[PDB]
Symmetry: D2
Subunit: 248 residues, 4 copies
């Protein structure tokens, strides 16, 4: 049975992805940073259906002198628990404003680290430790071509992640490792956001006036790691219900 | 059971797609132009497997005074044979050089008709004649961004098809019809091409140094039509083994 | 002195380009279809500043059996008047809705003809009839990525023109003919449109809440035809005040 | 007289850009890190032509605890020597391999700092310290869509810069600051590269089989800072001689 690492897999989209891949035979590594309780409950729920089919792994993905080693360990964790690592899902991601006009480098460290630099180090480590079906799926953002005002640093990071998806896809093709991305448009809203506001956002979606559910995002991810996407590498699969096509 | 129309579905990619959707319970209308034999052998094979599950339809898709009605009849052929039409696959495509420097308007009529205008009329007829899962999949070309020298017209047509995919996607969103596309890189080579030449082409693909099989392309189309892509509309799915990433 | 052909140069943007190039020393061929009077007033004004520096030319660019020859004559017009043709500016364009749901092929003929096919035949003739600084500038649309609901055919046509800009750029490079494009976002509004509606459009522009003047667009074209863009080919220059960057 | 800041302006492209803006009346800050001799000679050359029209500023743009402060001083320099800053050219850039398969974070610090994070901190400072004509121009890379194997981190950083170009453009529009980019394809080759190798690279450029000269790149930047681009913001101007258009 193939093993999969899911960053930020304790809740929301990452959680849904960890469950989908597990439902498909995958022995899923549930990485987290602050959501220990949720990660613990997930690993228990999964291992309940299948003994030793899940383990958790804690690690801060923000930029720092320890990041590199942490990423090596996150990957090494999959090998200790399952003796292999077939899939890596870079889902973990910080998201908040960094307005240009009125601490910053701490925001830079967290935004750039989780969205771009960690995935890089993780992909790198994942590759050097490697037939079967090896692949990486990066979680992008279909709306970054339309930069949300005040989110410059996050936007930059996601663009860097996009560049990493293509650079790694080409460089790793010879190693039989596919590298793709799933770019949601509007998906799980912030739980604290007022319903009125959530509704205003849902109505903007051309297809169904609704955000993508975590399961619909996981549908796309399951496909890219499946055999049905065996010739697919370097592609970013948009799942936005046509949101990016609408004009202001 | 649902019904799907596959233009140019008598052989190669279009054949693999008709077979695939049929294997998933679809009733198929196999359109063709000159591949009368294959069209017949396929429609019979499918009917052998399932009585009254496949019909055929002959037609030219080049620009002309009779194109509009031809497309209406192709779609109408699905409603007559099965009383319904849920999926439309725009696979039919003319492909050949049109060098700017040493008949042109005839080439423009055939290249643009098959690759863009016909798909336009087809989607139009399809949408006007329409819960279920209605979707359209256009067959694009991942390499049209790197214009093959001498294929100016073909390239313009495919580009028009991409605009069609997104324009229709948004416009038909309220009608619950999803419009997406699959963009192969190097797939089935011309049967007349010498092996030496075919091998020079295959070797350029980063992932495995091989062209995409028809089944691998059929895989992406099947995914975009499946329920696993219910939130996807207006997206082009590249299936090129990283080909578009390599520099000359 | 170099000669330039400006399609649809009788009024608005095309008129401003014509004048701008003339002011830079170009001998111009003001082409029109129905605005003979505006064309004549322009050609008259230009020749008053420099004798024999401007001639007008009439022709319909819609698809028809006469299109190929008409485009040939438009280019042949530059050579008859000035004995040369150094610059081609594809600005003439048909623009109106073509909703998918409640004559079409005549709309296709006009929208595809003026926006895509005529430019292809004109570039073809221009290239075949050829150191200096030879270049072509296609007038695109920055918002065609966010398809305006109900303008499917127009959008497809402009995409085709984009595909042409690049295919021609690469294929004509060995002939030292550069092919580029300018893509306005919101420029000259319809003269009939109510000031209320015009103002609602203006306020959407992030940079100044104003549409682009004909001159500003002229500035971009002038730059692309100049020596200052001698290494530029196959590029599309966006001029939208950041309009394409805003979210709905 | 407006004042401009040019990072990495001591040699090659940055040197040519500084000279070009200076010729247009611009008071140009020449930033450098290691090329003290060169920077000193350029400023002397410039002042010699116009007393007090040039000054230099030293600063490492790699990621570090000092970067934020350093970038602030770079912008501050323009205000100290000219009491104003109208133009920022983010030209400084590290470029070298970081292969995925056989110190890394130190490479990430140098590659991401110079190409993406410093520009971010510089634009941030620049905007906070501000009619006239304010604009930023980022030096991008037209080929980063075709990731050069082995240059992953450099590629990711340039992608982040492209993201910055668009996010900043939209966010600073209300403040009247235009943010654009110039993307060279093949320009000045490494001085130590053998001619044979240099020739191989040159022959790949479709337009003239030659790399772009620093002056041709400088031309594009001079246009984007000029009044002739007053409506232009958020656009990346490719200057590649058609290179990005050729298939492998
Ligand atoms: N939700 C949407 O609408 C939407 C739309 C487009 C794209 N996306 C993208 O889709 C993916 C999933 O979105 P989501 O909404 O589920 O994400 P999210 O809820 O924002 O969660 C990201 C998770 O990753 C972890 N994380 C964040 N910063 C980290 C850091 N510095 N170090 C280590 N872990 C860190 C956190 O885990 P802990 O809780 O364990 O700290 C956090 O729960 C993301 O990459 C996102 O950008 C989401
Ligand atoms: N093969 C590749 O490597 C590759 C790469 C990128 C994209 N694609 C795209 O993928 C799709 C399938 O590729 P393919 O290689 O299978 O295509 P293909 O073999 O060229 O088949 C095109 C089919 O469409 C029909 N057709 C051609 N011209 C027509 C016209 N004027 N009017 C009506 N029907 C016409 C033909 O039917 P009859 O045989 O019945 O005459 C033919 O079977 C195409 O849209 C193509 O552009 C293919
Ligand atoms: N205005 C904007 O906001 C905007 C925004 C984005 C892009 N654009 C693009 O910028 C360019 C110039 O815009 P514009 O507003 O000045 O255009 P426009 O006013 O619509 O003018 C198009 C001109 O082309 C000619 N024309 C139209 N249909 C024709 C046909 N079938 N055959 C031959 N000639 C035909 C007309 O000439 P006669 O008057 O002689 O009949 C007309 O003057 C166009 O290519 C447009 O797509 C404009
Ligand atoms: N040359 C090409 O073919 C080409 C092609 C595409 C894009 N470009 C882009 O065009 C721009 C100019 O290219 P170029 O070839 O002239 O550049 P380059 O010679 O590579 O020089 C970059 C300059 O920036 C400075 N620099 C590098 N790393 C730095 C760091 N960590 N901190 C502070 N300064 C640093 C250096 O200044 P000191 O010497 O003072 O240390 C160096 O001279 C770049 O942004 C480049 O990416 C160039
Ligand atoms: N990691 C990550 N988490 C997300 O929740 C997320 C993402 N990335 N990328 C894009 C996206 C799109 N959805 C949304 C939903 C609500 C607000 C909003 O107003 N947010 C507030 C509070 C957070 C804000 O910062 O303005 C922004 C984007 N959501
Ligand atoms: N409709 C269609 N059919 C294809 O087979 C096709 C397509 N479109 N689009 C792109 C593509 C990419 N593959 C290929 C393979 C071989 C040659 C080649 O030498 N062709 C000759 C004869 C045909 C040529 O016209 O130069 C060109 C493209 N193949
Ligand atoms: N040729 C051409 N002419 C234009 O004026 C034009 C163009 N192309 N492309 C894009 C564009 C963007 N501006 C606009 C301005 C007003 C309406 C509008 O409501 N129009 C009505 C009447 C025409 C409509 O058709 O709904 C649409 C687009 N304007
Ligand atoms: N900053 C910067 N400087 C450049 O010279 C540069 C750039 N960015 N971006 C792209 C680019 C494209 N030109 C080139 C030219 C030669 C080699 C080459 O073989 N390089 C060697 C030594 C450096 C290598 O690293 O393989 C790579 C790219 N050149």
């Amino acid at each position: 049975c193939p093993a999969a690492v899911i960053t930020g897999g304790a809740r929301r989209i990452g959680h849904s992805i960890a469950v989908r891949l597990h439902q498909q035979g995958f022995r899923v590594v549930v990485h987290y940073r602050h959501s220990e309780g949720a990660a613990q409950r997930l690993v228990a729920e999964l291992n309940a259906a299948r003994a030793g089919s899940a383990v958790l792994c804690k690690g801060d993905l923000s930029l720092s002198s320890s990041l590199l080693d942490c990423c090596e360990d996150i990957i090494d964790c999959s090998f200790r628990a399952f003796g292999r690592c077939d899939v890596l899902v870079n889902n973990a991601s910080a998201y908040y404003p960094t307005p240009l006009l009125p601490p910053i480098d701490a925001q830079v460290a967290e935004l750039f680290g989780s969205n771009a630099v960690a995935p890089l180090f993780l992909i790198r480590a994942f590759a050097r430790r490697q037939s079967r079906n090896l692949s990486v799926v990066n979680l992008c953002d279909a709306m970054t071509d339309l930069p949300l005002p005040g989110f410059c640093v996050y936007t930059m990071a996601k663009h860097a992640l996009g560049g990493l998806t293509r650079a790694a896809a080409l460089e790793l093709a010879p190693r039989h490792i596919r590298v793709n991305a799933v770019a949601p448009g509007l998906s799980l809203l912030p739980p604290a956001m007022p319903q009125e506001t959530q509704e205003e956002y849902r109505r903007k979606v051309p297809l169904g006036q609704s955000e993508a559910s975590a399961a619909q995002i996981a549908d796309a991810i399951a496909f890219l790691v499946s055999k049905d996407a065996g010739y697919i590498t370097g592609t970013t699969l948009k799942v936005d219900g046509g949101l990016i096509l609408a004009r202001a």
